[PDB]
Design a protein around this ligand. Structure first.
Ligand SMILES: C[C@H](O)CN1C(=O)c2c3c(c(O)c(=O)n2[C@@]12CC[C@H]1C[C@H]12)C(=O)N(Cc1ccc(F)c(Cl)c1)CC3
Ligand SMILES: C[C@H](O)CN1C(=O)c2c3c(c(O)c(=O)n2[C@@]12CC[C@H]1C[C@H]12)C(=O)N(Cc1ccc(F)c(Cl)c1)CC3
Ligand SMILES: [Mg+2]
Ligand SMILES: [Mg+2]
Ligand SMILES: [Mg+2]
Ligand SMILES: [Mg+2]
Ligand SMILES: [Mg+2]
Ligand SMILES: [Mg+2]
Ligand SMILES: [Zn+2]
Ligand SMILES: [Zn+2]
Lengths: 368, 184, 368, 184
DNA sequence: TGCGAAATTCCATGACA
DNA sequence: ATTGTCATGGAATTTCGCA
DNA sequence: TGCGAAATTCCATGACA
DNA sequence: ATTGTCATGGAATTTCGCA
């Protein structure tokens, strides 16, 4: 716009250009004497190209792009034009990191009864022991009572075999698992349908969702590590010992062991609690029903100073799962279809697929 | 005298030899005395080795204060006695030829033996896969004397698999003739 | 000590045993009726074995070991005896995690002049490009001016070849590097001695120590990623472009580019700053000397609520570098010989070797 | 008229053919007009390709506003002209047979040619490895006219390698006879 | 009605790779 | 069409033993 | 001597694997 | 015998343009 710049040279006011400055012509270009120095005022029709040229040098953000532009030019609301370019650079949007943390975690209510929800996961590969490499970990959500199964692979077949042994005791309402091949198979879905078991899946690449079993994986490995100090890593024969050990370990915050929450009475294990000896089994089960309901429940922690929470319609970006060397860590912008809760969201990518993702694997697209 | 509790006494015994199913010929039966809860383990023999291998799985969940059995070789061996002493389990035997347990247990072992016989007819070689459903049936079976099922008495909650459809347990004239046909 | 328990049964006071309780004999053992219930008082000579037995079930900490013991027994100051056992369990000490964070980071003073200190490091392996797999990154500490060299391996030979090209411009006083094979070799030490260059090494497995170059590795990779979007990863021909791009990029906090801090004048690059055009080179170098000294310097951040700082004589534990599966994450306790600064320490392991380590790779041994 | 600055003009030229050292036969010489700073690049030929390959390394550090050279084939080619236009570098040529630069530059190229000749005698095939030490020498060499060395004028600091031991640059009677011996 | 010490509770730290 | 968890050992706070 | 908007500064976040 | 760093883009704060 050389027409807009003409009125300025004459001396009459244009909204955006301060009247107190001296606008002139030199070397065939409109100039202005600003405190910083004499800058060139490019016509509106040239500004996009300048911003793009400045930005493209090192694909710089707001201030670093501005500082370059400001070396030669001046125009009203330069950063407004810088931000327009930053918001259109596909390379920057998919390569840059987020600088907004996720909102505070949710502390889902503890399942009310044992067998309401099981959390399952695999540990491994571990050093080979008797031809076994993996461990199938089953955690009852309410009690924390764990069942351990050595497997040769994290397969549907080994999960089914193990769970057919476990479910001889009781059948769970729900089985929560991650999106590992072993649990997302049609063979596993068929196995659950046949038994009235509902399969609930974690958002992908978010093991915090399976937090209950993940945390038990830490204790299993920590104990196996201790027992195997200065000996070959023959863990296969220790799984039963580890299982019994952990199921009978106090949780200092609850002041109960997973065995006690499941049965309301210690079995013939060392240091068995004898406090309900004079109670009848009915009096004992009545006290257990009371203990199970009065357990401590943590609350959501404070939000960090710079957190973001999802909004329907918001342009958001999913994190690349297994990013290759020298490739972007982010996918192209997506739109938030539904906000399931403040930490879970349904998105529609550029393909047109519906994906239920965790906000931990999302960043809000920058510059609107 | 202190009230009866789960894990106070486990009653063990062997069922078989049965037709081979997945290479297995016997079922070790474990019944908790108080709750009447049943655990079934298929073995390839009624041996101390098989008893120890099976009971090592059970004792990784809960350890009984006492194990009760008849004078079967597998239970009277010095090996099985060493295994029990290690776990602080007292062994208890019934008088030879005079097997005694309890009313609740004697009745439970009858239902076990009958339910197994009922499902053996037609598929006598497919019982290995049926052991989980047989246990859920047995453990979600209402107790006339106590008002509660073994599952309720052990966990203090109702089950997600209530076996409301209380079946016969007795053989139909068709199953009866089909059973005597296998006896050939 | 059954002698100590005898006086108690009679009814006369012993320090530690509250007089208000009823101490008796039953089943051939001293008992006490406590609010919790009737507990057995084992003789002092038996307590160590009980604590060890309770602890060994799942190698439990203080409260979880206590809660088991308290099920059957009672004695004065039980936790004092629990903590004695925890402090002697080699398995627990080398397997358990720390729960004390390191003290706040140091913000070393920025080198005063260009060429005072160089920070060097390798990036790679990268996808092969013209037979090259690595990048030798050289960062001048004062300026942030970077030199990039493609290499076939992170070798002493490729470092020497590259640095012989760089040092044709100017020779640094110090070269700071990590403990990578390429820089710790005798051939590299010989190469530096020959040139008056002092080699300074980071504490091992602490890349924050090489923070200056590490941070530049992020910008190099981020820019290569952007330029290679939707094209094969042919990075070899982009190193020169990336080098020039980054050396001429503004640091928004300094309001200077690494080129400007090194030369005090922009070269014929896009958007070159023209503010010193009327100054003589001497006036220009005078202003540069002033700019170099007035640069922003960050200060140590606040200590976290539960931080630990090293003390000479303290029992401390070094983190295992490459821990194997099911093996302890910590080495056996060591003693702090000298405290170089609050974040660096000299230790003596059980072998008798002197090691200069970062507190980030140390935990203070628990239970004194 | 604005004061002279570094990167305002780079004076380029070729030295050689020299005895082969590591396969190289020539040295492209780049002297900054203002500071007198020297960059040396060994080439296998005085070609546009070699000039472009060498200057691509230099222009990754700093880009001159103007390049000055004589009418040598490598610098007058349309390829070298395309290369300069791409980088916004103005090419400037001296009149054929009349090479003009500046007093500071003319003197610098004399020291370069002399220092090279001085070190070529005895080890004429080992100059590739000596190029870094030759440049540090040249750049840490005090300027009578300006009071400062090219290193000081370019970085605004003293160097860590001061070449206080100001040598001869002239050939000794032993080096003179040894030089004429090679001329065979 | 209050003191010193012991017992209990709190809770940041870090790992489930 | 879902969602972090909790053992750990110093510190902080409460309770105990006695008066 | 004070208003609205623009410009600048602040700074938590996250990655150098 | 050593030690974190700094681009990034919303928010917070300051400065500018005008009166
Ligand atoms: C392709 C790649 O293998 C994908 N993948 C994992 O990386 C992975 C992890 C874990 C799994 O259970 C798990 O199944 N996987 C899968 C996804 C499904 C199946 C292929 C396996 C896992 O537990 N960890 C440890 C971890 C780390 C941080 C935490 F906050 C928590 Cl709570 C746990 C994190 C890595
Ligand atoms: C045997 C194993 O290869 C050992 N090792 C590394 O793991 C490693 C890293 C790094 C190196 O430079 C580096 O040299 N190494 C070496 C040690 C010496 C040589 C064998 C290589 C490195 O930069 N990163 C990224 C990183 C991560 C977190 C940070 F806070 C920072 Cl500032 C950077 C962390 C991993
Ligand atoms: Mg998994
Ligand atoms: Mg996992
Ligand atoms: Mg019998
Ligand atoms: Mg390195
Ligand atoms: Mg590194
Ligand atoms: Mg010439
Ligand atoms: Zn960009
Ligand atoms: Zn231990």
């Amino acid at each position: 716009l050389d027409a807009e710049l003409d009125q300025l040279l004459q001396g009459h006011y244009i909204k955006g250009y301060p009247k107190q400055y001296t606008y002139f012509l030199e070397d065939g270009k409109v100039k202005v004497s600003r405190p910083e120095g004499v800058k060139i005022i490019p016509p509106q029709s040239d500004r996009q190209k300048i911003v793009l040229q400045a930005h493209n040098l090192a694909h710089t953000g707001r201030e670093a792009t501005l500082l370059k532009i400001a070396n030669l030019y001046w125009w009203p609301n330069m950063r407004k034009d810088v931000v327009k370019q930053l918001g259109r650079c596909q390379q920057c949007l998919i390569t840059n990191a987020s600088n907004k943390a996720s909102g505070p975690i949710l502390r889902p209510d503890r399942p009310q009864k044992p067998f309401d929800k099981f959390f399952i996961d695999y540990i491994g590969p571990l050093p080979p022991s008797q031809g076994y490499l993996y461990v199938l970990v089953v955690v009852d959500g309410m009690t924390g009572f764990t069942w351990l199964y050595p497997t040769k692979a994290p397969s549907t077949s080994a999960t089914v075999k193990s769970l057919n042994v476990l479910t001889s005791i009781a059948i769970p309402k729900v089985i929560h698992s991650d999106q590992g091949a072993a649990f997302t198979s049609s063979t596993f879905a068929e196995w659950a349908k046949e038994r009235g078991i509902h399969l609930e899946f974690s958002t992908p690449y978010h093991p915090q969702s399976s937090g209950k079993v993940e945390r038990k994986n830490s204790d299993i490995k920590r104990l196996l590590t201790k027992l195997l100090v200065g000996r070959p890593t023959k863990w296969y024969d220790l799984l039963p010992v580890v299982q019994l050990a952990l199921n009978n370990t106090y949780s200092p915050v609850l002041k109960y062991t997973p065995h006690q929450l499941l049965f309301g009475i210690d079995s013939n294990t060392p240091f068995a609690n004898q406090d309900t000896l004079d109670l009848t089994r009915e009096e004992e089960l009545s006290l257990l029903q009371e203990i199970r309901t009065s357990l401590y429940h943590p609350s959501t922690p404070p939000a960090s100073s710079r957190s973001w929470s999802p909004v329907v319609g918001q342009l958001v970006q999913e994190r690349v799962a297994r990013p290759a060397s020298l490739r972007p860590r982010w996918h192209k912008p997506s739109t938030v279809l539904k906000v399931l809760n403040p930490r879970t969201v349904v998105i529609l990518d550029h393909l047109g697929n519906n994906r239920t993702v965790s906000i931990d694997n999302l960043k809000p697209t920058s510059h609107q | 005298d202190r009230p009866q509790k789960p894990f106070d006494k486990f009653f063990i015994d062997y069922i078989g030899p049965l037709p081979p199913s997945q290479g297995y010929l016997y079922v070790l039966v474990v019944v908790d005395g108080m709750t009447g809860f049943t655990w079934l383990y298929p073995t390839k023999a009624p041996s101390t080795s098989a008893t120890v291998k099976s009971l090592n799985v059970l004792t990784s969940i809960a350890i009984p204060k006492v194990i009760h059995s008849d004078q079967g070789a597998a239970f009277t061996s010095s090996t099985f006695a060493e295994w029990a002493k290690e776990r602080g389990i007292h062994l208890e035997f019934s008088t030879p030829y005079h097997p005694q347990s309890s009313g609740k247990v004697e009745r439970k072992n009858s239902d076990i033996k009958r339910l197994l016989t009922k499902l053996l007819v037609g598929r006598p070689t497919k019982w290995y896969d049926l052991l989980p459903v047989v246990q859920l049936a047995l453990n979600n079976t209402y107790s006339p004397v106590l008002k509660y099922t073994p599952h309720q008495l052990l966990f203090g909650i109702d089950s997600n698999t209530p076996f409301a459809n209380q079946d016969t347990l007795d053989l139909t004239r068709e199953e009866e003739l089909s059973l005597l046909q296998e006896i050939r």
